[PDB]
Amino acid sequence: PEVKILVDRDPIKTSFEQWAKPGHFSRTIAKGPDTTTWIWNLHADAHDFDSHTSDLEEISRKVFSAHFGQLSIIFLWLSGMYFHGARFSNYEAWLNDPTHIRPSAQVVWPIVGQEILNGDVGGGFRGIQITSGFFQIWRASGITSELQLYCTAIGALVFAALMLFAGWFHYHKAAPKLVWFQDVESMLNHHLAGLLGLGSLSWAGHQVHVSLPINQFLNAGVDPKEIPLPHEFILNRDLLAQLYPSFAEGATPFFTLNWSKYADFLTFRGGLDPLTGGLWLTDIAHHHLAIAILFLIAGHMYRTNWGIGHGIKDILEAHKGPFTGQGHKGLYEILTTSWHAQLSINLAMLGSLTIIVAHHMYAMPPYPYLATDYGTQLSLFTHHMWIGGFLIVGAAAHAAIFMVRDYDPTTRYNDLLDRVLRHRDAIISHLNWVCIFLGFHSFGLYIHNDTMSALGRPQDMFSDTAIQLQPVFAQWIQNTHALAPGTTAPGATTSTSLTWGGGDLVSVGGKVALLPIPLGTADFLVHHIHAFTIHVTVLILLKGVLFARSSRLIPDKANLGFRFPCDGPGRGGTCQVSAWDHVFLGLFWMYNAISVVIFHFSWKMQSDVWGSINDQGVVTHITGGNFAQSSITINGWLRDFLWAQASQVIQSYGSSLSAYGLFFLGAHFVWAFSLMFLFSGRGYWQELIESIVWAHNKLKVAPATQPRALSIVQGRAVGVTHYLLGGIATTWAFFLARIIAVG
Amino acid sequence: TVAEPDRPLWFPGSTPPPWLDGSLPGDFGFDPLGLGSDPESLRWNVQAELVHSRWAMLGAAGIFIPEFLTKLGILNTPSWYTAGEQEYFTDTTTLFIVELVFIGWAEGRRWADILNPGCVNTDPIFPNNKLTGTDVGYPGGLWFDPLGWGSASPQKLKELRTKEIKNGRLAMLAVMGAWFQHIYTGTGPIDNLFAHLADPGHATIFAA
Amino acid sequence: FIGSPTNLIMVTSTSLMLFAGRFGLAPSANRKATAGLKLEARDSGLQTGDPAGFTLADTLACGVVGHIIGVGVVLGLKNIG
Amino acid sequence: RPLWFASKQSLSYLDGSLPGDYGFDPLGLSDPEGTGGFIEPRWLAYGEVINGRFAMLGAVGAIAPEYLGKVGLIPQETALAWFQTGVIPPAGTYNYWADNYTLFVLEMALMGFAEHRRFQDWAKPGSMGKQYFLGLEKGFGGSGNPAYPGGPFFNPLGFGKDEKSLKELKLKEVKNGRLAMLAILGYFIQGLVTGVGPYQNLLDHVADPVNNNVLTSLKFH
Amino acid sequence: MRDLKTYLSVAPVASTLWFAALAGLLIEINRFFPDALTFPFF
């Protein structure tokens, strides 16, 4: 009942015996290779811990140690970032003049004429321009010299070493026992308070002392090398008092509850900083302070050792109504004995969170000189969108894995899950109908507009000048947001973001940072397209999860497992009936949806937001507002978006962006190559390999390990992997070249 | 071999590795990484350590005695670090090649003996010479042991070999230290010694 | 700044909340909460010296929540008057 | 035997076999049940004793130079607060016979010899009375209990020939170690918020209790 | 050591070391004689 620390000593002794034996985990694999297929299997089941054994304790220990290893990898990656910024970057030159110099933190050695990639990025530097946005982060943190970057890189390297040692020590010397992993109340309490709340408090403390005074000096125009070091602001307090007088009293306002006196650096302004084009740092510090309070309070909910608290089992079992029987009874036991359930929930939540992060980050830019760095904005949005989509698809993959493997009503029975499995047919039928209806009305309208335009009947089109489909609800919501400050939210001076409205365009260095985004008929159509694609991919994934165990076609689908090619050509053909194949199709549909989303974002930003301001205030947008009138037809998307904006990438040859054109063509190649695997079957390839192997046998040069063709599931996996790589990489090259040449 | 279970150890209180039973001269049980576990690899490493020790002792002598000799106004050897480019009677490449063939001959003889003990002790020109040494790494003979100081009881030769290997390890560390000093500082080892002795409290690593 | 309205409000708030905690009136460490209406009796493990089973964790929690409510009330009052 | 804020689970493994056993382990770190690396109860007891010993040394030392800096011939420049000695260079430095960094390296070499020998005794008890060490190894044997090795070096005056005397002396030792330990925590936090020095802080407080903790809440530095 | 040698000769590790060496050799050859489109020696 009590929460305590439980471990076991020396479960596995570090050694090299198992290194010499490939595939120790599986007995048959340990025996040795008979055919080349063996090799692939060895990799396909490397991290499938729950299949190598059945003991929950061993699986948990392996998961914990692998987490430590991945954390070490992340720390090494961050240390590499900071070191490259410290040595192979023009960070100080960019710091002196942000808008003038293009950030760059990578140079290429001159070996085979590749030194052309070391382009003129400004600041007396030649390198490869970086769109990761690290320079903005370092500026917002208060880093001014390369000594600080060097120190951060060394510290991150040391922490990577510490993470690696922690993984080794916890798997081989002191491995926590199962009851330790199953203690979720204390885990939630610590993560809510110890990690998130305390970490946010720490970051707020840094921002108050380092970010605020340093960025204030930088924005005042002081040269970066003449600014006092970040530690001075802590030693002598009058340094802070000068910038913000309220530091003079020092803490006594905080303890007498005269918190209003801290209004100097703890504000609720909102909007953007007109000088840097980012959020007010005095708002971000207050943000993190409030977040710290909220999380430190929320991390005191679940009972651990002193009676006070909440039992998660009690909360779950206290909820149930007439429509769900005894719902929520038994879920606690399901979520504390199966790792795949937790993994699916967490993957779904993290994917949604990453998508929201992208949306909010281009909505109101949080870093200085980030809004006008168009390449950085576009790259960050697209990257986070793709990461979130992949995580969401993985959520379905692991939900199906749990359903096939760990779901068991005889021992762990849940009522809600049973009811869902009992009316899955109705669920999927209605979802199918919704998908069809959305597909017809979203895409069908595009086809209608295209046909009308081709027939010379623009008056019949679904456009802003013919038949309008105005998103009244979105317009009303953003109008309510624009009027919010001073009416419904009195304490805020500027609206949350400048996309809501209110005018007040914000520009920096002759470039538009942000301004109100209008919503019209084209926006309505593209939003409905988004809804259609999301619903179809959800249909695929949900159908894969629900029908994972059985269906009217194969009543014993669970016995075949989560991953398997088919069940033969019987019953008319049972190709791709497994849940893994449903994830395989969901990958294609997720790619479709995310590609359309990023295309919409890019074209809308270029057409109606990004651009150059002039002396009279006349905004010239990168694309002259052609989105509203050209995006309502497929021909416009093919002509005014793809054709028009591919000129930047295709011309990149002979310059520093030639690598982008090379990657454009190579991504096209890899994508077309994937179709080789996606369209064929392994029987033909095995038959051809037979003749090849005979040709080898004729010369006494045949391999002992017989070369078999790829398995069916492996063929599908290779096809989808190559398809995704090619498509995403060609879009990556297109976006980067376009926005670096035109931005 | 005389296995000494209770020999002094590099890390007092810890058991030495099984493969280090004190047979070799100068065995203190130091093998954290366990590089010498394999017997054949152990023999190869023993030979490598012996040759490294002898080369490094020669180098330490020829780097330090000459500079301790030129620091005092006795003669005028230049700095060892930059001694490679001061032009001699001929260019460096020809000297390198002529030196290479000779030392390659010697090292080939040594290699043949290492991988096949007692198979090259006889002189190929006059087959009545014969190196007396019967141990790999210890050729002996009139050439490499004219005085015959180390041909007595095995116990005496054991501690003499231990003396050899310990002096060799010291010389290896000395030569590496001279290199690292000259690259870190810009003076000679004797200059470093004199400066540090003048100011033992401040003239150290932490002066930069 | 001692005995002032803010100090008096925070005192009375924390004192009243802790007094509730020590007796019934609130979910103590040894007193379970059913649905906010009835309180059951349990032993949390940690033993108490106070006769009423008021544990150190209980007094810490009661004080903390008392300070939270006092801070909220005082800040609101000073915000409007 | 009085106990302070003990727990029923803590009372199980805290029976009184160790000096200063007041049953105070609400946290439960000394779990045996769960025993592990550095969490093993004997290691925790050893750490308590060693930390208390070092803290007693540091508490009698960090307060000394700025005491006798007021009384005696001792030079004014020589006597500084425990934080101005060069331990924290930003708060003040001093010019000794060495660089402060080579001082660290020398301190580290000596302390390393001592601490490595101590640990190798802890792991395999009695292993340091074997290998040579300019003699002196017969005095580095140990007594089975690592925290109390004894011998000619660590107990030359022969205190506590009988066992009870040793029991009560261990109790006094652990109590004084805890006192000095908490006092060093006080040193740290006082010198942080108050930034004057422990002895001068005591002197200016004992003039009158005007200098309360709440007074320093303004936090000048 | 023996097991380290064994694992150090397994297909992936051996292949990566071989290809790193080959890449370095080709890189150096190109560096010394870059922009070579014919064999002029004979």
Ligand code: CLA
């Ligand atoms: C440092 C010495 C060391 C040694 C000698 C061993 C030895 C062993 N470990 Mg172990 N381990 C170590 C460190 C070590 N480990 C560390 C630091 C961690 C924390 C991550 C772990 C965590 C760990 C776990 C969880 C497990 C083992 C297991 C094992 C045993 C099985 C074979 C094996 O190691 O896998 C194969 C050897 C490899 C080198 C595989 C590669 C793994 C690395 C992390 C890949 C690097 C990722 C890379 C950056 C990916 C990008 C690709 C890109 C480069 C193209 C074996 C006796 C397994 C076991 O005991 O089975 C019961 C077991 O499940 N270890």
Ligand code: CLA
């Ligand atoms: C924290 C996230 C997370 C974690 C911990 C896991 C963990 C796991 N997953 Mg999973 N998954 C995730 C996210 C995650 N997944 C996401 C986001 C998706 C959607 C794409 C999936 C979809 C998925 C499927 C379909 C399956 C799993 C499976 C598994 C299990 C075995 C995986 C394995 O080792 O096979 C081997 C792993 C490999 C061979 C590595 C693949 C290498 C990729 C394809 C190359 C990447 C290319 C690179 C990015 C760019 C090119 C570089 C190159 C040119 C050098 C394992 C427990 C398998 C299972 O059976 O579950 C039990 C399985 O069938 N996952």
Ligand code: CLA
């Ligand atoms: C092997 C014997 C040896 C000896 C006697 C010395 C002696 C000396 N070194 Mg040196 N050094 C050595 C090896 C040695 N070194 C090695 C192997 C390296 C490579 C890491 C260095 C790299 C080095 C540098 C970069 C510098 C010195 C310097 C110095 C001088 C001042 C000490 C100092 O501050 O640096 C500290 C040196 C170290 C921390 C490395 C020494 C560690 C090795 C393992 C030797 C350990 C000693 C050994 C156990 C006992 C020796 C036996 C006997 C001679 C007493 C001093 C006279 C400094 C100088 O020039 O003076 C101004 C200086 O800048 N050394």
Ligand SMILES: CC1=C[C@H](O)CC(C)(C)[C@H]1/C=C/C(C)=C/C=C/C(C)=C/C=C/C=C(C)/C=C/C=C(C)/C=C/C1=C(C)C[C@H](O)CC1(C)C
């Ligand atoms: C037990 C427990 C468990 C349960 O269950 C719960 C709870 C209650 C939580 C807990 C708690 C605990 C605690 C609190 C502890 C603390 C500790 C400390 C403070 C230590 C120190 C400790 C401390 C220490 C060692 C110290 C040491 C010191 C020294 C050496 C010093 C030195 C010096 C000096 C002199 C002066 C100069 O000028 C400087 C220097 C150089 C610096």
Ligand code: SF4
């Ligand atoms: S074509 Fe392939 S997947 Fe389809 S039934 Fe036949 S073997 Fe199975």
Ligand SMILES: [Ca+2]
């Ligand atoms: Ca325990």
